[PDB]
Amino acid sequence: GSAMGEPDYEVDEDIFRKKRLTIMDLHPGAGKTKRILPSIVREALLRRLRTLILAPTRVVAAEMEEALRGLPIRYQTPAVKSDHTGREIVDLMCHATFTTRLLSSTRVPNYNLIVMDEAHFTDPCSVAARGYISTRVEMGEAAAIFMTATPPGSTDPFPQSNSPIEDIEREIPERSWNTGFDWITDYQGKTVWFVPSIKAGNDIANCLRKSGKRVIQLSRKTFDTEYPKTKLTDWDFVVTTDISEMGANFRAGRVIDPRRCLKPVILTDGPERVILAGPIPVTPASAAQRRGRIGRNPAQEDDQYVFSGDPLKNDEDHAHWTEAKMLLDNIYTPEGIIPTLFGPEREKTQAIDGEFRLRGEQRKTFVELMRRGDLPVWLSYKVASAGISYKDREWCFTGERNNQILEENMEVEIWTREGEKKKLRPKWLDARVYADPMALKDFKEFASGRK
Ligand SMILES: [Cl-]
Numbered sequence: 001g002s003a004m005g006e007p008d009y010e011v012d013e014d015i016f017r018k019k020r021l022t023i024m025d026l027h028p029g030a031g032k033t034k035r036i037l038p039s040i041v042r043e044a045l046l047r048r049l050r051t052l053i054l055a056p057t058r059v060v061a062a063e064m065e066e067a068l069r070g071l072p073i074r075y076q077t078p079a080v081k082s083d084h085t086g087r088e089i090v091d092l093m094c095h096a097t098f099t100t101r102l103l104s105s106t107r108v109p110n111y112n113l114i115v116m117d118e119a120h121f122t123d124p125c126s127v128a129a130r131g132y133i134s135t136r137v138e139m140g141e142a143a144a145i146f147m148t149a150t151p152p153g154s155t156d157p158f159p160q161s162n163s164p165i166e167d168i169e170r171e172i173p174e175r176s177w178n179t180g181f182d183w184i185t186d187y188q189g190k191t192v193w194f195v196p197s198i199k200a201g202n203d204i205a206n207c208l209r210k211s212g213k214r215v216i217q218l219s220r221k222t223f224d225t226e227y228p229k230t231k232l233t234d235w236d237f238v239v240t241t242d243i244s245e246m247g248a249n250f251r252a253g254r255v256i257d258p259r260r261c262l263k264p265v266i267l268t269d270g271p272e273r274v275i276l277a278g279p280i281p282v283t284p285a286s287a288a289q290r291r292g293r294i295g296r297n298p299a300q301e302d303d304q305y306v307f308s309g310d311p312l313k314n315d316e317d318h319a320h321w322t323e324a325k326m327l328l329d330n331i332y333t334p335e336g337i338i339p340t341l342f343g344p345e346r347e348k349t350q351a352i353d354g355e356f357r358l359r360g361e362q363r364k365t366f367v368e369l370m371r372r373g374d375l376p377v378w379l380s381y382k383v384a385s386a387g388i389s390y391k392d393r394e395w396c397f398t399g400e401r402n403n404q405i406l407e408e409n410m411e412v413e414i415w416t417r418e419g420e421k422k423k424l425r426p427k428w429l430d431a432r433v434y435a436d437p438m439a440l441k442d443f444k445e446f447a448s449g450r451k
Pocket residue numbers: 218219220221241242243
């Protein structure tokens with residue numbers, strides 16, 4: 001005899017039709033959806049469709065490569081601007097790689113099926129990618145599938161799960177604690193703890209570690225190397241920023257979620273600048289994705305989501321919305337049309353389509369500052385639109401006095417490329433380049449002309 005197992009996934013013809021944007025949920029961990037993406041790709045190739053798969057992270061991309069083994073899959077790095085084979089091939093790349101290629105090449109294929117995994121990702125490049133994809137679909141040039149449990153527009157913090165979740169509302173430490181939270185450390189299972197910042201995570205992680213807990217920390221910059229370690233069993237806590245809202249699959253029994261985040265906001269009273277506001281409450285969708293780390297396994301029925309406070313849905317002042325438009329406005333198309341945001345996300349900005357469009361060398365510098373310089377979209381836009389070349393780092397030193405960067409109450413002083421010692425004092429302030437120690441380290445590297 002045998003077990004039935006997951007049955008063959010017969011694909012809806014509708015999902016391949018041009019002008020169709022399908023939203024679906026893979027419900028990972030159940031686990032009864034292993035055959036879905038493979039089947040979609042198989043049927044796409046049967047129909048001779050030019051197919052693109054977009055993963056949120058390199059990690060997820062690699063897991064896809066394994067899942068799709070035996071199919072003509074080709075991973076695409078952002079180090080290459082285009083890669084055209086004479087052959088039937090499915091391109092696989094990160095959200096950001098797609099947007100980067102659209103900004104940097106005239107040779108981006110006319111994909112007529114586009115699959116975006118974790119399509120809720122609200123990083124500017126992901127938002128822009130959705131805008132471009134939805135525009136191509138509405139043009140009748142493509143069909144697309146957005147895969148996510150929380151499609152843009154969703155406002156449900158407590159959505160369906162594969163397995164019962166116990167939603168527990170109680171006070172959660174925002175920093176190191178001495179007593180009064182025994183439930184945190186008495187818990188015998190594995191916990192994923194969402195924190196608003198790396199700094200906050202450091203404090204929490206250190207406090208857990210001093211009590212004998214084994215802790216893995218995750219952030220955007222460290223996700224690539226550290227996440228793989230969570231696939232082993234030798235940990236008690238994952239302490240992570242919001243990055244783990246995007247496809248991270250933990251074998252854990254508990255989420256701890258104070259429902260806090262930092263939000264980049266462009267201020268406009270005086271010289272435009274980006275601050276990191278908060279901690280403030282997360283959106284319902286974010287809360288849902290944090291909660292959604294657990295309750296994935298029907299055989300494990302006692303998972304917990306421990307949270308504090310209610311979410312806040314209004315995020316219209318998030319810098320990512322403006323930054324999305326800065327990317328979109330600089331993506332061209334042979335039709336001569338500037339791509340607009342995905343429908344549900346249009347209400348997030350009152351920017352006029354095309355207003356951030358740059359021309360010629362300024363556009364190229366814009367892209368280089370983001371790719372090679374690893375600068376935020378907003379900051380890259382300000383520098384590029386000022387007519388500054390990539391290699392010209394004078395602007396890092398010629399800002400007003402109030403723009404002086406501090407570290408430990410000390411005024412930061414660095415070498416220029418030419419070998420002069422100057423105060424770090426950028427013409428444009430973006431908190432995302434100096435707030436976190438590691439971010440400031442990288443920005444100092446940039447200012448000194450070392451990349
Ligand atoms: Cl992060």
